Coordinates of C-alpha atoms and ligand atoms in Angstrom, one line a residue:
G12 CA -11.4 -26.6 -79.4
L13 CA -9.3 -29.1 -77.4
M14 CA -7.4 -26.3 -75.5
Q15 CA -8.5 -26.2 -71.8
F16 CA -7.2 -23.6 -69.3
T17 CA -5.8 -25.5 -66.2
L18 CA -4.9 -23.8 -63.0
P19 CA -2.3 -24.9 -60.4
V20 CA -3.8 -27.4 -57.9
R21 CA -4.5 -24.9 -55.0
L22 CA -6.4 -22.5 -57.5
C23 CA -8.2 -25.4 -59.3
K24 CA -9.7 -26.4 -55.8
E25 CA -10.2 -23.0 -54.1
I26 CA -11.7 -21.2 -57.2
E27 CA -14.9 -23.4 -56.6
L28 CA -15.3 -21.8 -53.1
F29 CA -17.3 -18.6 -52.6
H30 CA -14.4 -17.0 -50.5
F31 CA -11.7 -17.5 -53.2
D32 CA -9.3 -14.5 -53.6
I33 CA -7.9 -14.2 -57.2
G34 CA -4.4 -13.2 -55.8
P35 CA -1.9 -10.4 -56.7
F36 CA -0.7 -11.8 -60.1
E37 CA -2.6 -9.6 -62.6
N38 CA -1.4 -11.7 -65.6
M39 CA -3.3 -14.8 -64.3
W40 CA -6.7 -13.0 -64.1
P41 CA -7.6 -13.3 -67.8
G42 CA -6.9 -17.1 -67.6
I43 CA -8.9 -17.4 -64.3
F44 CA -11.9 -15.7 -66.1
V45 CA -11.6 -18.0 -69.2
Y46 CA -11.4 -21.1 -66.9
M47 CA -14.6 -19.9 -65.2
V48 CA -16.4 -19.3 -68.6
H49 CA -15.3 -22.8 -69.8
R50 CA -16.5 -24.7 -66.6
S51 CA -19.6 -22.4 -66.2
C52 CA -20.8 -22.2 -69.8
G53 CA -18.7 -24.5 -72.0
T54 CA -15.4 -24.6 -74.1
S55 CA -17.8 -23.8 -77.1
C56 CA -19.8 -20.8 -75.6
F57 CA -17.2 -18.3 -77.1
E58 CA -14.5 -18.3 -79.9
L59 CA -11.3 -18.3 -77.7
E60 CA -9.6 -15.7 -80.0
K61 CA -12.6 -13.3 -79.7
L62 CA -13.0 -13.9 -76.0
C63 CA -9.3 -13.2 -75.3
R64 CA -9.5 -9.9 -77.4
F65 CA -12.7 -8.9 -75.5
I66 CA -11.1 -9.6 -72.1
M67 CA -8.0 -7.5 -72.9
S68 CA -10.1 -4.6 -74.3
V69 CA -12.3 -4.7 -71.1
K70 CA -9.1 -4.7 -68.9
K71 CA -7.7 -1.7 -70.8
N72 CA -11.0 0.3 -70.1
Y73 CA -10.8 -0.2 -66.3
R74 CA -8.7 2.7 -64.7
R75 CA -5.9 2.7 -62.0
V76 CA -8.3 3.5 -59.1
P77 CA -7.9 2.0 -55.6
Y78 CA -11.0 -0.2 -55.7
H79 CA -13.3 0.1 -58.9
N80 CA -10.5 -1.5 -61.0
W81 CA -9.8 -4.6 -63.1
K82 CA -9.2 -6.8 -59.9
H83 CA -12.8 -5.8 -58.7
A84 CA -14.3 -6.8 -62.1
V85 CA -12.7 -10.3 -62.0
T86 CA -13.5 -10.7 -58.3
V87 CA -17.2 -10.0 -59.0
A88 CA -17.2 -12.4 -62.0
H89 CA -15.8 -15.2 -59.7
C90 CA -18.6 -14.7 -57.1
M91 CA -21.1 -15.1 -60.0
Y92 CA -19.2 -18.2 -61.2
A93 CA -19.5 -19.7 -57.6
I94 CA -23.3 -18.8 -57.5
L95 CA -23.9 -20.4 -61.0
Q96 CA -21.8 -23.6 -60.3
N97 CA -23.7 -24.2 -57.0
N98 CA -27.1 -23.7 -58.9
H99 CA -26.4 -25.9 -61.9
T100 CA -29.9 -26.3 -63.3
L101 CA -31.6 -23.0 -62.3
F102 CA -30.1 -20.8 -65.1
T103 CA -30.4 -20.9 -69.0
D104 CA -27.4 -21.2 -71.3
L105 CA -27.9 -17.5 -72.3
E106 CA -28.0 -16.4 -68.6
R107 CA -24.6 -18.2 -67.8
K108 CA -23.1 -16.6 -70.9
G109 CA -24.5 -13.1 -70.2
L110 CA -23.9 -12.9 -66.4
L111 CA -20.1 -13.6 -66.3
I112 CA -19.7 -11.0 -69.1
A113 CA -22.0 -8.6 -67.2
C114 CA -19.9 -9.0 -64.0
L115 CA -16.6 -8.5 -65.9
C116 CA -18.1 -5.3 -67.5
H117 CA -20.2 -3.9 -64.6
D118 CA -17.8 -1.1 -63.6
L119 CA -16.1 -0.3 -67.0
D120 CA -14.4 3.1 -67.0
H121 CA -15.2 3.8 -63.3
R122 CA -13.4 7.0 -62.2
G123 CA -13.7 6.2 -58.4
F124 CA -16.6 8.5 -57.8
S125 CA -20.3 7.9 -56.9
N126 CA -23.4 9.0 -58.9
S127 CA -23.9 11.7 -56.1
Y128 CA -20.5 13.2 -56.8
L129 CA -21.0 13.3 -60.6
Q130 CA -24.4 15.1 -60.0
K131 CA -22.9 17.7 -57.5
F132 CA -19.9 18.2 -59.9
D133 CA -22.4 18.7 -62.8
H134 CA -20.4 16.0 -64.8
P135 CA -21.6 15.6 -68.4
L136 CA -22.6 11.9 -67.7
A137 CA -25.1 13.3 -65.1
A138 CA -26.8 15.3 -68.0
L139 CA -26.8 12.2 -70.3
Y140 CA -28.1 9.7 -67.6
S141 CA -30.2 11.3 -64.8
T142 CA -30.3 8.1 -62.7
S143 CA -27.9 5.1 -62.4
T144 CA -25.5 7.5 -64.0
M145 CA -22.3 5.4 -63.8
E146 CA -24.2 2.1 -64.5
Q147 CA -25.7 3.4 -67.8
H148 CA -22.1 4.5 -68.7
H149 CA -20.8 1.0 -67.8
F150 CA -23.5 -0.6 -70.1
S151 CA -22.6 1.9 -72.9
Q152 CA -18.9 1.0 -72.6
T153 CA -19.7 -2.8 -72.7
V154 CA -21.8 -2.3 -76.0
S155 CA -18.9 -0.1 -77.5
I156 CA -16.3 -2.9 -76.8
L157 CA -18.7 -5.7 -78.2
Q158 CA -18.8 -3.5 -81.5
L159 CA -15.0 -3.3 -81.9
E160 CA -13.9 -5.4 -85.0
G161 CA -13.1 -9.0 -83.8
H162 CA -14.7 -8.4 -80.3
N163 CA -18.3 -9.7 -80.9
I164 CA -18.2 -12.8 -78.7
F165 CA -22.0 -13.3 -79.2
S166 CA -21.7 -13.6 -83.1
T167 CA -22.8 -17.3 -83.2
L168 CA -26.1 -16.4 -81.3
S169 CA -29.2 -15.9 -83.5
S170 CA -30.6 -12.3 -83.7
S171 CA -33.3 -12.9 -80.9
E172 CA -30.7 -14.6 -78.6
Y173 CA -28.3 -11.7 -79.2
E174 CA -31.1 -9.2 -78.2
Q175 CA -31.9 -11.4 -75.1
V176 CA -28.3 -11.6 -73.8
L177 CA -27.7 -7.8 -74.3
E178 CA -30.9 -7.3 -72.3
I179 CA -29.7 -9.7 -69.5
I180 CA -26.4 -7.8 -69.4
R181 CA -28.1 -4.3 -69.4
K182 CA -30.5 -5.2 -66.5
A183 CA -27.6 -7.0 -64.6
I184 CA -25.3 -3.9 -64.8
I185 CA -28.1 -1.4 -64.0
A186 CA -29.0 -3.6 -60.9
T187 CA -25.4 -2.9 -59.5
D188 CA -26.7 0.6 -58.7
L189 CA -27.0 0.1 -54.9
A190 CA -29.8 2.9 -54.8
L191 CA -32.0 0.3 -56.7
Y192 CA -31.0 -2.7 -54.4
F193 CA -33.2 -1.7 -51.4
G194 CA -36.6 -1.8 -53.2
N195 CA -35.5 -4.8 -55.3
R196 CA -34.7 -6.9 -52.1
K197 CA -38.0 -5.6 -50.4
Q198 CA -40.1 -6.9 -53.4
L199 CA -38.1 -10.2 -53.4
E200 CA -38.7 -10.5 -49.5
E201 CA -42.5 -9.9 -50.0
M202 CA -42.6 -12.5 -52.9
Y203 CA -40.7 -15.2 -51.1
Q204 CA -42.8 -14.9 -47.9
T205 CA -46.3 -14.7 -49.6
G206 CA -45.0 -17.6 -51.8
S207 CA -45.7 -15.7 -55.0
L208 CA -42.0 -16.0 -56.2
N209 CA -42.1 -17.7 -59.7
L210 CA -38.8 -18.4 -61.5
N211 CA -40.8 -18.9 -64.8
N212 CA -42.0 -15.3 -64.5
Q213 CA -39.4 -13.2 -66.4
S214 CA -40.0 -10.0 -64.2
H215 CA -39.2 -12.3 -61.1
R216 CA -36.0 -13.8 -62.7
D217 CA -34.9 -10.2 -63.5
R218 CA -35.3 -9.3 -59.8
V219 CA -33.4 -12.5 -58.7
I220 CA -30.6 -11.8 -61.2
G221 CA -30.5 -8.2 -59.8
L222 CA -30.0 -9.5 -56.2
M223 CA -27.3 -11.9 -57.5
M224 CA -25.5 -8.8 -59.0
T225 CA -25.7 -6.9 -55.7
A226 CA -24.4 -10.1 -53.9
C227 CA -21.5 -10.5 -56.3
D228 CA -20.7 -6.7 -56.3
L229 CA -20.5 -6.6 -52.4
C230 CA -18.7 -10.0 -52.2
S231 CA -15.6 -8.3 -50.5
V232 CA -17.7 -8.8 -47.2
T233 CA -17.9 -12.6 -47.9
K234 CA -14.1 -13.3 -48.0
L235 CA -11.9 -14.4 -45.1
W236 CA -11.4 -11.5 -42.6
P237 CA -7.8 -10.6 -43.7
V238 CA -9.0 -10.2 -47.4
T239 CA -12.2 -8.3 -46.2
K240 CA -10.1 -6.0 -43.9
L241 CA -7.4 -5.2 -46.6
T242 CA -10.1 -4.7 -49.3
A243 CA -12.0 -2.2 -47.0
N244 CA -8.8 0.0 -47.1
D245 CA -9.1 0.2 -51.0
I246 CA -12.9 1.0 -50.8
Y247 CA -12.2 3.8 -48.2
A248 CA -9.2 5.2 -50.3
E249 CA -11.8 6.0 -53.0
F250 CA -14.4 7.4 -50.6
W251 CA -11.8 9.6 -48.9
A252 CA -10.7 11.0 -52.3
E253 CA -14.4 11.7 -53.2
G254 CA -14.8 13.4 -49.7
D255 CA -11.7 15.6 -50.6
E256 CA -13.4 16.5 -53.9
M257 CA -16.8 17.3 -52.1
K258 CA -14.8 19.7 -49.8
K259 CA -13.3 21.3 -53.0
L260 CA -16.9 22.0 -54.2
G261 CA -17.5 23.5 -50.7
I262 CA -19.8 20.6 -49.6
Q263 CA -19.1 18.8 -46.3
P264 CA -19.0 15.0 -47.3
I265 CA -21.0 12.3 -45.4
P266 CA -18.7 11.0 -42.6
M267 CA -18.1 7.7 -44.5
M268 CA -16.1 9.8 -47.1
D269 CA -14.5 12.2 -44.7
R270 CA -10.8 11.1 -44.0
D271 CA -10.9 13.3 -40.8
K272 CA -13.5 10.8 -39.4
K273 CA -11.5 7.5 -39.8
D274 CA -12.5 6.6 -36.2
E275 CA -16.2 6.2 -37.3
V276 CA -15.4 3.5 -40.0
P277 CA -15.9 0.5 -37.7
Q278 CA -19.4 1.8 -36.7
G279 CA -20.1 2.7 -40.4
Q280 CA -19.3 -0.9 -41.4
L281 CA -21.8 -2.4 -38.8
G282 CA -24.6 -0.2 -40.3
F283 CA -23.6 -1.3 -43.8
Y284 CA -23.6 -5.1 -42.8
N285 CA -26.9 -4.7 -41.0
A286 CA -28.7 -2.3 -43.5
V287 CA -27.2 -3.8 -46.8
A288 CA -25.0 -6.9 -46.7
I289 CA -26.7 -9.3 -44.3
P290 CA -30.3 -8.6 -45.7
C291 CA -28.9 -9.1 -49.3
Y292 CA -27.2 -12.5 -48.6
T293 CA -30.2 -13.6 -46.4
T294 CA -32.8 -13.0 -49.1
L295 CA -30.4 -14.6 -51.6
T296 CA -30.0 -17.7 -49.4
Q297 CA -33.9 -18.0 -49.1
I298 CA -34.2 -17.9 -53.0
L299 CA -31.0 -19.9 -53.7
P300 CA -30.2 -22.2 -50.7
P301 CA -26.7 -23.3 -51.9
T302 CA -25.4 -19.6 -51.6
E303 CA -25.6 -19.9 -47.7
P304 CA -21.7 -19.8 -47.5
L305 CA -21.9 -16.1 -48.6
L306 CA -24.3 -15.3 -45.7
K307 CA -22.2 -17.3 -43.2
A308 CA -18.9 -15.5 -44.3
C309 CA -20.7 -12.1 -44.1
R310 CA -21.9 -12.9 -40.6
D311 CA -18.3 -13.9 -39.6
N312 CA -17.1 -10.5 -40.9
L313 CA -19.8 -8.6 -39.0
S314 CA -18.5 -10.3 -35.8
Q315 CA -14.9 -9.3 -36.7
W316 CA -16.0 -5.5 -37.1
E317 CA -17.8 -5.8 -33.7
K318 CA -14.4 -7.0 -32.2
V319 CA -12.6 -3.9 -33.9
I320 CA -15.1 -1.6 -32.0
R321 CA -14.6 -3.5 -28.6
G322 CA -10.9 -2.7 -29.1
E323 CA -10.0 -6.5 -29.3
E324 CA -8.3 -5.6 -32.7
Ligands
JKX1 O1 -21.9 2.3 -46.3 C1 -21.0 1.9 -47.0 C2 -19.9 1.1 -46.3 C3 -18.7 0.9 -47.2 N1 -19.3 0.4 -48.5 C4 -18.9 -0.9 -48.9 C5 -19.4 -1.5 -50.0 C6 -19.0 -2.8 -50.3 C7 -18.1 -3.4 -49.5 C8 -17.7 -2.8 -48.3 F1 -16.9 -3.3 -47.4 N2 -18.1 -1.5 -48.1 C9 -20.2 1.1 -49.3 C10 -21.0 2.1 -48.5
MG2 MG1 -20.6 0.0 -59.9
ZN3 ZN1 -18.7 -3.0 -58.7

């Protein structure tokens, strides 16, 4: 019980900042995650032996894809850590427990392909799960790992608390389906403005947790520019592979996924920042004022992409 994780001084300090990059040393990522659980939840939230076995089984079930990989999982969990630590009193003990685990698990067994590609391929997962195809799969994989012998990190929870945390995790992972983000944020925008937003209303909390999940999932756009720019390469490496596989099915891919149209990427990023990222962090900042640094960092990166177009880099 008296065993803390301690990070080197630079990491101890920078891990608290929204724009923290977890670095290229894969062997430090489990420790970084446990550190965040301990400060965010408590040294008592999970049996360390069970947590460590859970983390390593989750790691093993992420694939060697350019972007939707183990580093993404830990990166998304860290953004959630930063949101939770800057909003100390707004979240229940169960929520803090559930949401870091949800973020670590949210892309389990990702193959580097969109729901659209699974559907056009006629992948079996598309038959099993007609909407949020990969996200239902990710939740399924999370449940499977929790049910491995010695992997049930929620064992000390009562039966009702166990049902509540699995429900928090299921909704959180489904919410990472970007197709669902647009309507979720629209409803949150309406509720904030008409003043009807009520954090004691479970359906309202669900919506707010959904937006937090989108914010954490997209957090590549809230890093310092050199991290954002280098991460963009990894995201486009997957999209360009999917575009190649679309062409193999005899379907012209959307320009975003066509490696023949690399020139259009800067303009595609503006659309994304304007249509998705900025609105996401804006609505999040309205509901949770201390998440403003995410919106400010996102705005800084929008300005960097505008400079790429203007040939200034
Ligand atoms: O339109 C799109 C632009 C590229 N996309 C993302 C998604 C997260 C982060 C980031 F830099 N880009 C997804 C689709
Ligand atoms: Mg996903
Ligand atoms: Zn993700």
